[PDB]
Ligand binder design. Structure first.
Ligand SMILES: [Mg+2]
Ligand SMILES: [Mg+2]
Ligand SMILES: [Mg+2]
Ligand SMILES: [Mg+2]
Ligand SMILES: [Mg+2]
Ligand SMILES: [Mg+2]
Ligand SMILES: [Mg+2]
Ligand SMILES: [Mg+2]
Ligand SMILES: [Mg+2]
Ligand SMILES: [Mg+2]
Ligand SMILES: [Mg+2]
Ligand SMILES: [Mg+2]
Ligand SMILES: [Mg+2]
Ligand SMILES: [Mg+2]
Ligand SMILES: [Mg+2]
Ligand SMILES: [Mg+2]
Ligand SMILES: [Mg+2]
Ligand SMILES: [Mg+2]
Ligand SMILES: [Mg+2]
Ligand SMILES: [Mg+2]
Ligand SMILES: [Mg+2]
Ligand SMILES: [Mg+2]
Ligand SMILES: [Mg+2]
Ligand SMILES: [Mg+2]
Ligand SMILES: [Mg+2]
Ligand SMILES: [Mg+2]
Ligand SMILES: [Mg+2]
Ligand SMILES: [Mg+2]
Ligand SMILES: [Mg+2]
Ligand SMILES: [Mg+2]
Ligand SMILES: [Mg+2]
Ligand SMILES: [Mg+2]
Ligand SMILES: [Mg+2]
Ligand SMILES: [Mg+2]
Ligand SMILES: [Mg+2]
Ligand SMILES: [Mg+2]
Lengths: 167, 131, 260, 188, 155
RNA sequence: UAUCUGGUUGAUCCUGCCAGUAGUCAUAUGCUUGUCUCAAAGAUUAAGCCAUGCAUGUCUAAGUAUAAGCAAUUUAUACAGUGAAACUGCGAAUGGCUCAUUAAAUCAGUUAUCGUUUAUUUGAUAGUUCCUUUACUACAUGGUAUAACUGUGGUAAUUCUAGAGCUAAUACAUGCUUAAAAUCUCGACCCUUUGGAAGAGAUGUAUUUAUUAGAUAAAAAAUCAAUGUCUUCGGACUCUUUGAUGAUUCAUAAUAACUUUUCGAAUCGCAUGGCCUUGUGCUGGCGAUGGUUCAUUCAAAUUUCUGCCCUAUCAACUUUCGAUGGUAGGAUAGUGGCCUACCAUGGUUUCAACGGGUAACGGGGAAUAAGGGUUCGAUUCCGGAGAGGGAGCCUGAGAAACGGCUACCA
RNA sequence: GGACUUUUACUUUGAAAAAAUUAGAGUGUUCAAAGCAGGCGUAUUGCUCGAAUAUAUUAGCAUGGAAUAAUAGAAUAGGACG
RNA sequence: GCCCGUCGCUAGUACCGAUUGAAUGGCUUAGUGAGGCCUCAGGAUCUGGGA
């Protein structure tokens, strides 16, 4: 059963330290590496299977292969990704082109479409507006609080020259 | 991890184990106040022993030292309370006196005998132990 | 011990909480906040063990998640939030305000205070420094950063605060003869003016205290919280005004109030 | 790992100390950057509490300042020529703090001849104004001016390359230039 | 200890960040820095007059003095720029209700602002760890030389 | 709560031990056992070994839902309830257990950080991002590649997973933006001065380096090189500003540059309002999550003074291959022989070093009651150490972690 | 704020201090070991006392004393004040 | 009367002792040296020099 691992070369098994983001390993825990047996990337007679990928079709249909097609499961859901599964320009309003999947409820044919994401909306503009506005209003605030101190300081010096001409 | 549950023991047992004299002196007491152990007399003279020890220790500080006035006065008011110490001899060189009998005499087993209500010290022991 | 300790066994708990020996094995470890661990009264302790309001601890969370209680004005949810000396606990239901302020035995008393007075607190400025952009600032014993204070404001002075808003609305210097609250030592909760300070360069300035009963006593500086003039306290005090009676003086008072 | 504890290591009396506890990680040491000259190559290292030291393995420029002229430039670093800790650093051209390097000069030249209008060694209007202003202030210094002829200036690395990924210095000057020159020849 | 040379090292010795602009022809050659350790200790003139370097000088260097101020009697000066003092003290065994003589040596750095010989009572001050053993720095001589010059030849 | 008795002789007085006697939060064992309350308990021997089950997981209105999931209704043809799986986030460094090691170590009391790291809680904190600056940069919002899933599989066998096909974001990876002003550099031109001038670039914060400012110990003057503000054109400079500390090269700020450039909101939930020049323009409520820097709070690490049981049938000890100190560096979160290089010859000791033993974790304390003492503390709280023995490491704020991993030994 | 101070031992008072333990006050857990409670009433919409005190020494800190016991000082005057 | 030593019997303890006797524990020279970490190279694939 041991899996092949691209690029080991070798037509035998070895035991590597595999990490996150690596093939033939799903880490159970953060920063966890388990040492594991691995099969080489060179095909031997000891193989139970050979995983294969067609890249050029021949001169005849293979029964349940060419002849049949199985449809993609999910459709686009991120805003722009819908835009480009129909080639649409930032103009064509994705709301219509989001995919729609029928499904019946005994005697209720029901419909459910994705939650389109990263879509620009009235709401998100109200939030980009508030950001900028607040940055400034604070900035103004700070200045008004700043000079309001500078004064407190300046008309203290204008008391240490009324304390120096008094006594 | 739970806090400690605290306890003390409440009696003390005679140095010499076969003093004929203390023996008689003991039996008689259990005989008069209707006691069942020798422990009921051990307990009390233990009680008596520490009280005296406090007393002893208080009279070593000179008169009118705060702790002496606090803890001393305390010890007396508490004694008179339950009826061990005379109203008059009430300044703790007589708390220094104070034999076992004075303590014995104040038990609810004796009180319940002393104003009749039982007639015989044991009848009292029984009625009390019987609700 | 590999990381921050998260639990608090009883017995290890500060005693001025009045927690009881049995009935458990843990005490509500005070959260991180504006008061040191060992000088706080977690909500859970005050809402249940002082105020007798909730019974379960469980109810204290449930009381709290109504935005019911609120400290210094902000609302505060933390069961084990560290509340502490000079703060202002408030119940909008039961129209009730409290300041946190010390007994004389050394404890936090229950202390009803007016709505008016419930809107401003006192903070011992614990340091003053220059911040980025040369903006000076003070920080006060309850972890308050306040930019732009008076120049005259230096460390150990005390400060009156809007709570409602951020700011400092008055301040009081540390001079011989100034009403002083004592926050630590065996003289915790006592109150008395200031005779004078012992200098001692590089290691614990000392502070001689004289109360309104002509008794005198010392506590290391840091343990002193200035709070007004002889007479005028800048906040309402608790009964007994931190004057500390001898065990005797108390026994006699306690059993003067004896005739039903 | 490397360990900076003192609990190995004999006592002042010279006694031997039992091993008490295993190595903690907070008393860790790591290996030297041993940084060399060459096309830039830096690796970050995750230090305690978030945080990063940049371990420079290969540095070819650095920003060096001519302290008396109140400026700094970024020059190629020519090489290491003196090291007080270990001669092997010099021989292997290893950059560390305090090493003595040679840099480039020609950015400090392009500044000086542009600022004093004077040229080291051997026609605008505002410029002429500004150069006339600067004088009795242009007199460089012998042992430093004589350095530009070879196009290489001696400078002392002031930074810690294995720490921050910078190799930064200051041109050698006055009394300090004397010291190292006396060394560079009284050994030559 | 030092004595002489000042530039006796492989690295050029200098006070950090105390630049002297060679362009400005001056009389003092090297600008020198100094401070007072505080706590009332005078900084000896030999620290301000001298040209020695020492980054462990409490008056001309980058150390601070904070913590125990102790005094002890000098008992070894064989180390260069650092010494060992003995602090004697008596120790109360109860039970017998009397004391016994004890001591400890304490290694301490010693700025060439001071000239110390063995026997001198000296006041030292607490330091950031300065070396493996040394956690103290000589900070005044409450001594002199122990009347050596009144041990001379003959009438 | 200050007590003694029996035993040497023919008898006597001593010396002196054996014996008796009493207590023990002090264990075992024997016999006996009815009630209330209370409630220690595999420490000792073997930190010996372990079958099996359990002991760490976690969701708010508020990161991610096309379950081909449940539900129906109540506006919802993008989404909207509820919600498996899974991604993401945080926790798993606490807790609990044990006492093997450990004798100047730990630990206590007392110090130091002007010698550092710090999730979080709390309080403060950001108009600066692009470009040789009119035919111009997605900001009405830019990139894919992935789990779950679908489907093809492999092995006797595990919390093994391969090949193929989908698709999300507060994952990953990018990348715009805003006032006014001042001050610096450069400087086209013009005109001789005493010289001035359009208008051009630069200036968030963080990083690294160098140079400055950060006064104050009571007061005055001349002169050189620069060169500031106001001319009653000889000149005058007049008010001139300064934080903390016992102490600093402190806090802060300024100059010239540096950087595989730190941070500067492409996020989410409720509400929906104003405002005319009717653009779905331009505004705008409450509060979540974030986010740099500083503070605070929970911590941590190092650390000063003094204090440990028996031992000389342990007297000299320490530098091989650091022992003690100096310079420099490297390494660290940071001091520091912590490591390296060069150099020197130091450091400790009859006031007991060094070595040996401990049937040794240290304390709070426990037992014994005239006092002085003697003995005990594995064990309910604090500290430390460990996870079969060693070593190494990943993740992370925090582990040299063991209900994490890797290797050797058993 | 400056300019400078012979060293110590002892002893007083005080600070800084964990709780449980110990000693000990208050309260009648029916008693007691314990516990830190509880106690009054309008007992139908509340009144109220508490949760002390002590010991905590050796060391370090802080303050009083100046007996007792050490230390240092002026004799080749290189003395002290100006 | 007391009493001393050799010699003899039973039982027990400890010493000396060929066996360069044995066993457990702690350090440790020399040689061999796993594995993670760092570092010089490497380029299965997979994109804009990097991974
Ligand atoms: Mg979204
Ligand atoms: Mg633990
Ligand atoms: Mg908590
Ligand atoms: Mg301080
Ligand atoms: Mg030496
Ligand atoms: Mg006989
Ligand atoms: Mg006989
Ligand atoms: Mg006879
Ligand atoms: Mg006996
Ligand atoms: Mg146990
Ligand atoms: Mg065991
Ligand atoms: Mg749905
Ligand atoms: Mg990709
Ligand atoms: Mg992110
Ligand atoms: Mg000046
Ligand atoms: Mg100042
Ligand atoms: Mg600085
Ligand atoms: Mg609208
Ligand atoms: Mg022996
Ligand atoms: Mg060194
Ligand atoms: Mg030698
Ligand atoms: Mg001895
Ligand atoms: Mg042991
Ligand atoms: Mg113990
Ligand atoms: Mg012991
Ligand atoms: Mg054991
Ligand atoms: Mg551990
Ligand atoms: Mg085991
Ligand atoms: Mg080993
Ligand atoms: Mg481990
Ligand atoms: Mg386990
Ligand atoms: Mg664990
Ligand atoms: Mg005392
Ligand atoms: Mg108590
Ligand atoms: Mg053999
Ligand atoms: Mg290397």
């Amino acid at each position: 059963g041991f899996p092949m691992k691209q690029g080991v070369l070798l037509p035998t098994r070895i035991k590597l330290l595999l990490t996150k983001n690596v093939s033939c390993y799903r880490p159970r825990r953060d920063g966890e590496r388990k040492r594991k047996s691995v099969r080489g990337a060179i095909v031997g007679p000891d193989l139970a299977v050979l995983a294969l990928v067609i890249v050029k079709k021949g001169e005849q249909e293979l029964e349940g292969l060419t002849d049949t097609t199985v449809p993609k499961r999910l459709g686009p859901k991120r805003a722009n990704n819908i835009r480009k599964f129909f080639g649409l320009s930032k103009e064509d309003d994705v709301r219509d082109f989001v995919i729609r999947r029928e499904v019946t409820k005994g005697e209720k044919t029901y419909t459910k479409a994705p939650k389109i994401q990263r879509l620009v909306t009235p709401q998100r503009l109200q939030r980009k507006r508030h950001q900028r506005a607040l940055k400034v209003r604070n900035a103004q605030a700070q200045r008004e609080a700043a000079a309001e101190y500078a004064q407190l300081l300046a008309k203290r010096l204008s008391e240490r020259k009324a304390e120096k001409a008094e006594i | 991890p739970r806090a400690p549950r605290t306890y003390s023991k409440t009696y003390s047992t005679p140095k010499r184990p076969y003093e004929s004299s203390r023996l008689d002196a003991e039996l008689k007491l259990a005989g008069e106040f209707g006691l069942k152990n020798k422990k009921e007399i051990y307990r009390i003279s233990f009680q008596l022993s520490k009280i005296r020890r406090a007393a002893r220790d208080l009279l070593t500080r000179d008169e009118k030292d705060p702790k002496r006035l606090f803890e001393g006065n305390a010890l007396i008011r508490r004694l008179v309370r339950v009826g061990v110490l005379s109203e008059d001899k009430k300044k703790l060189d007589y708390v220094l006196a104070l034999k076992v009998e004075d303590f014995l005499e104040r038990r609810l087993q004796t009180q319940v005998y002393k104003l009749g209500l039982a007639k015989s010290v044991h009848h009292a022991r029984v009625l009390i132990t019987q609700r | 011990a590999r990381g921050p300790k998260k639990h608090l066994k009883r017995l290890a708990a500060p005693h001025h909480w009045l927690l009881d020996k049995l009935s458990g094995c843990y005490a509500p470890r005070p959260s991180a906040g504006p008061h040191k661990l060992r000088e706080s009264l977690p909500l859970i302790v005050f809402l249940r063990n002082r105020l007798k309001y909730a019974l379960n601890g469980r109810e204290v969370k449930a009381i709290l998640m109504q935005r019911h209680v609120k400290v210094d004005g902000k609302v505060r949810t933390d069961t084990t939030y560290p509340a502490g000396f000079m703060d202002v606990i408030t119940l909008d239901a039961t129209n009730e305000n409290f300041r946190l302020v010390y007994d004389v035995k050394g404890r936090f008393a229950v202390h009803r205070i007016t709505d008016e007075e419930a809107s401003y607190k006192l903070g011992k400025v614990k340091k003053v420094q220059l911040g980025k952009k040369g903006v000076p600032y003070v920080v006060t014993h309850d972890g308050r950063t306040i930019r732009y204070p008076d120049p005259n404001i230096k460390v150990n002075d005390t400060v009156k605060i809007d709570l409602a808003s951020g700011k400092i609305t008055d301040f009081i210097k540390f001079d011989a003869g100034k009403l002083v609250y004592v926050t630590g030592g065996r003289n915790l909760g006592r109150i008395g003016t200031i005779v004078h300070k012992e200098r001692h360069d590089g290691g614990f300035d000392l502070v001689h205290i004289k109360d309104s009963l002509d008794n005198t006593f010392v506590t290391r500086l840091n343990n002193v919280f200035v709070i007004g003039e002889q007479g005028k306290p800048y906040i309402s005090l608790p009964k007994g005004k931190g004057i500390k009676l001898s065990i005797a003086e108390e026994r006699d008072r306690r059993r003067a109030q004896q005739g039903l | 790992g490397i360990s900076r504890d003192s609990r190995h290591k004999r006592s002042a009396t010279g006694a031997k100390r039992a091993q008490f506890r295993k190595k903690r990680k907070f008393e860790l040491g790591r290996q030297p950057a041993n940084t060399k000259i060459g096309a830039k190559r830096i690796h970050s290292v995750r230090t305690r509490g978030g945080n990063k030291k940049y371990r420079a393995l290969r540095i070819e420029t650095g920003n060096f300042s001519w302290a008396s002229e109140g400026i700094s430039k970024k020059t190629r670093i020519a090489g290491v020529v003196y090291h007080p800790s270990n001669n092997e650093l010099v021989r292997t051209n290893t950059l560390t703090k305090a090493a003595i390097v040679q840099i480039d000069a020609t950015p400090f030249r392009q500044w000086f001849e542009a600022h004093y209008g004077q040229t080291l060694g051997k026609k605008s209007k505002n410029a002429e104004r500004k150069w006339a202003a600067r004088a009795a202030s242009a007199k460089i210094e012998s042992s430093v001016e004589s350095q530009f002829s070879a196009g290489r200036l001696y400078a002392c690395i002031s930074s810690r390359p294995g720490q921050s990924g910078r190799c930064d210095g200051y041109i050698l000057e006055g009394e300090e230039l004397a010291f190292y020159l006396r060394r560079l020849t009284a050994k030559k | 200890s030092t004595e002489l040379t000042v530039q006796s090292e492989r690295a050029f010795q200098k006070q950090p960040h105390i630049f002297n602009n060679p362009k400005v022809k001056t009389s003092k050659r090297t600008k020198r820095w100094y401070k007072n350790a505080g706590l009332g200790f005078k900084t000896p003139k030999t620290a301000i007059e001298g040209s020695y370097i020492d980054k462990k000088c409490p008056f001309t260097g980058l150390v601070s003095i904070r913590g125990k101020i102790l005094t002890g009697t000098v008992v070894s000066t064989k180390m260069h720029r650092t010494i060992v003092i003995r602090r004697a003290y008596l120790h109360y065994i109860p039970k017998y209700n009397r004391y016994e003589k004890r001591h400890k040596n304490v290694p301490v750095h010693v700025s060439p602002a001071f000239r110390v010989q063995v026997g001198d009572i000296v006041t030292v001050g607490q330091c950031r760890p300065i070396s493996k053993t040394v956690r103290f720095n000589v900070v005044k001589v409450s001594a002199a030389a122990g009347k050596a010059n009144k041990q001379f030849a003959k009438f």
